């Protein structure tokens with residue numbers, strides 16, 4: 001698939017707003033993911049013991065991981081589809097070390113969309129959401145293909 005420059009513009013415009021508060025958006029997205037799909041929290045050995053949203057908001061480790069996650073995603077989106085080099089180490093660790101199924105990448109995409117819709121309504125109208133969804137589908141398609149080459153493809 002290929003996004004048009006106009007679609008990338010819509011994606012990078014709202015992303016510029018997300019970058020004004022990287023740690024806060026990282027926390028919001030992880031919490032949304034963990035509340036909606038509790039099974040995903042089991043993948044994080046460091047903090048899978050957290051029981052409530054209050055504990056999640058208070059976790060320094062969760063916040064740190066949120067920033068690491070968002071910074072990596074931001075670097076990929078800024079490549080505008082030319083993310084082959086960035087995808088390699090990411091695909092290898094999530095398939096072989098962490099064992100993250102493609103379905104979990106769909107769940108986090110949903111959480112990213114929920115959070116941007118709540119925090120940035122004016123810059124996240126129907127067209128902008130369509131463009132963000134297209135960018136995330138592209139990322140998922142490419143990483144799934146990479147998983148397959150690596151021997152995981154789940």
Ligand code: HEM
Nearest residue numbers: 040043044046068069072073090093094098100104105108
């Ligand atoms: C847009 C998708 C994602 C991006 C860009 C991303 C990015 C990262 C980055 C950069 C790291 C640290 C380096 C590494 O281990 O590769 C990481 C670690 C990890 N990620 Fe992700 N990730 C994504 C999705 C997920 C999802 C959906 C899950 C789980 C349900 C997950 C679970 C983990 C785990 C368990 C680690 C290890 C954390 C630790 O070191 O304690 N990732 N991810």
